[PDB]
Design an enzyme around this catalytic site. Sequence first.
Site, PDB file in Angstrom:
ATOM      1  N   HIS A   1      48.546  90.273  24.840  1.00 56.63           N
ATOM      2  CA  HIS A   1      48.462  89.967  23.404  1.00 56.63           C
ATOM      3  C   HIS A   1      49.849  89.836  22.752  1.00 56.63           C
ATOM      4  O   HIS A   1      49.918  89.465  21.585  1.00 56.63           O
ATOM      5  CB  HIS A   1      47.534  90.915  22.635  1.00 56.63           C
ATOM      6  CG  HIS A   1      48.011  92.328  22.520  1.00 56.63           C
ATOM      7  ND1 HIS A   1      47.228  93.391  22.956  1.00 56.63           N
ATOM      8  CD2 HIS A   1      49.129  92.822  21.942  1.00 56.63           C
ATOM      9  CE1 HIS A   1      47.917  94.485  22.667  1.00 56.63           C
ATOM     10  NE2 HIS A   1      49.073  94.190  22.067  1.00 56.63           N
TER      11      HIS A   1
ATOM     12  N   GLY B   1      53.521  99.012  17.416  1.00 59.76           N
ATOM     13  CA  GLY B   1      54.652  98.881  18.322  1.00 59.76           C
ATOM     14  C   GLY B   1      54.496  99.684  19.605  1.00 59.76           C
ATOM     15  O   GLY B   1      55.281  99.488  20.533  1.00 59.76           O
TER      16      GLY B   1
ATOM     17  N   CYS C   1      52.038  99.411  21.814  1.00 58.40           N
ATOM     18  CA  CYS C   1      51.367  98.643  22.862  1.00 58.40           C
ATOM     19  C   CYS C   1      52.288  98.454  24.061  1.00 58.40           C
ATOM     20  O   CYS C   1      53.497  98.342  23.892  1.00 58.40           O
ATOM     21  CB  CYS C   1      50.839  97.317  22.321  1.00 58.40           C
ATOM     22  SG  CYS C   1      49.344  97.481  21.305  1.00 58.40           S
TER      23      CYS C   1
END
Lengths: 304, 304
Positions: free
Chosen positions: A41, A143, A145
């Site tokens: 993503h 942030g 991820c």
Amino acid sequence: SGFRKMAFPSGKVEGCMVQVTCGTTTLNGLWLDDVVYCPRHVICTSEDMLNPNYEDLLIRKSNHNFLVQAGNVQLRVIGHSMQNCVLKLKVDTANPKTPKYKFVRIQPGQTFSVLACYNGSPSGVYQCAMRPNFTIKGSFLNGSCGSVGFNIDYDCVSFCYMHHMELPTGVHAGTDLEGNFYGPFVDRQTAQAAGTDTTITVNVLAWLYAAVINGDRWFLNRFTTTLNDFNLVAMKYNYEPLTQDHVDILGPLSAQTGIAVLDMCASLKELLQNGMNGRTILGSALLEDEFTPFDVVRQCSGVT
Amino acid sequence: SGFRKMAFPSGKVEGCMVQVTCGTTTLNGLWLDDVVYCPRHVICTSEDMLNPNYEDLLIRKSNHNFLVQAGNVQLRVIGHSMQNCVLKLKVDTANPKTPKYKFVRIQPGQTFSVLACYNGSPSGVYQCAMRPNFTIKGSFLNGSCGSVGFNIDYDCVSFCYMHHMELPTGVHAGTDLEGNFYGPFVDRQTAQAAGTDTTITVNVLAWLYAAVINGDRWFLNRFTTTLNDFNLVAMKYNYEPLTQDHVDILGPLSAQTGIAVLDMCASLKELLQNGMNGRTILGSALLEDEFTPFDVVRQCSGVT
Ligand SMILES: *CC(=O)N1CCC[C@@H](N(CC2CCCCC2)[C@H]2CC[C@H](O)CC2)C1
Ligand SMILES: *CC(=O)N1CCC[C@@H](N(CC2CCCCC2)[C@H]2CC[C@H](O)CC2)C1
């Protein structure tokens, strides 16, 4: 003595964290050998986050669009590919800090440590369990991820989780390191149902054994039960059914303490039916399920 | 979102752990620059552990009696000295993995991470608080002595604790890195009274703010109180008195949430007087006090 929710030392994993930027999206990547792993993503935008066509989105990206930074040094991206929900960015330099590692897909009920990271920088480490419904109750802000979950066996890191998203309920979903989601989750901004979660019975029993080893014995009673009787109670209280495999894994703790697994099940049965009556066990006022039988033996024996 | 008892990433500290042996006693040491720090009780034996004369015991030891091993490599001991309850072994090689560091003496109520070690090898990391009575509720087995507590500010490690002993009550006592014990404890095998412990009120309030930020708001009520009224309740329930310094440190959390500190005190007052009524806050069935206002802001903002 003492019992704590202990995480593995995060050093071997800190050396693998990098920052990955694509367009204006920045998240964390894991640099192992000459490959950087991150959530796919990272290539999507606000316009298409409701239902991204990752194949089409990745086609508009070239190696030079993926900015990978390891601390202050930039890595050169020589390849890119998508495997399930992860992006694999081939770099021209192998990570000199790559530990001995494996990629493993953990089972629900198993535990692991998480190194929460922001901008490729480690912020903290905590221990958690993969819920029976394949979510984790973590601590992740924007942030985070690409932050990973892992276990350490002497010098070997087994990476088991990469963080992808937070569900509207505040629980967390992610993938194994091959990019396969744990549970039914998809990487898109949509309402997604996490199933009915249940308490990890074998872990609660393991923690009750840890309590006995450390002197908290008030919950021990003069009763016993059967696997079938116990499971009638477990179902009533949304606990996972206990199997003979679970009884077998509790063997060492049963042996060390001299309390038969079914006698500990009767103590657990009484705690479920009567509550704690304002008392605590290992500094907790509820039944803890994020310690496996392996964690209890490790902590109570000193495995480094 | 989510709230976890998070420890600092332990990497910078793992690189400093060494094993120290003297006679037949082995424990952990901390290698910083060309000095190895460890508990002085490494020189004592079972015969004299009731009341060791450390000055006389150290006189029978020479540099070559202190065996310091960093992983698989042996360090050469060129000096030895005792500073309070720590031994400082000068070595001929500066640790190449020495991070930026400071030695700090923390205040009671402050938190820190512990890297539990055995034979100079890191086993796990957990977050804890220095109790108001100067003990810590850790997880330490035989061989864990010399394991350290620390905080990390960007690239700087502030070492604040070195583990020395477990009291007969199962709680832990240790020193700062200058070898001064926290609390009234001495390094001898004798029954030692840990004072009456109290709950760290400013930390419980900080955690209540963390709960509100994360959506757990059921405990918010239509009441307010005064510092004096609140302190009458705090004393009744063995909570530390709240001062205006504590109210001032809660300022940022009060500002972010819009809940005045004295309104949160009234919520805490009601929770103390009425209990949780079978409910939970941030997955806990009791009032958590091992998160400072700094920890809550850090975790809720993403400080790496
Ligand atoms: C978790 C993380 O660090 N990141 C990187 C920044 C974007 C972020 N979210 C987008 C994706 C879209 C696809 C499905 C997972 C989440 C957003 C979502 C909106 C929210 O308001 C901010 C974070 C993931
Ligand atoms: C905590 C630790 O690792 N070590 C090293 C091995 C000895 C150990 N204890 C001795 C000292 C004596 C002075 C006061 C602190 C403890 C013993 C005490 C007896 C017990 O049965 C085993 C550990 C400290």
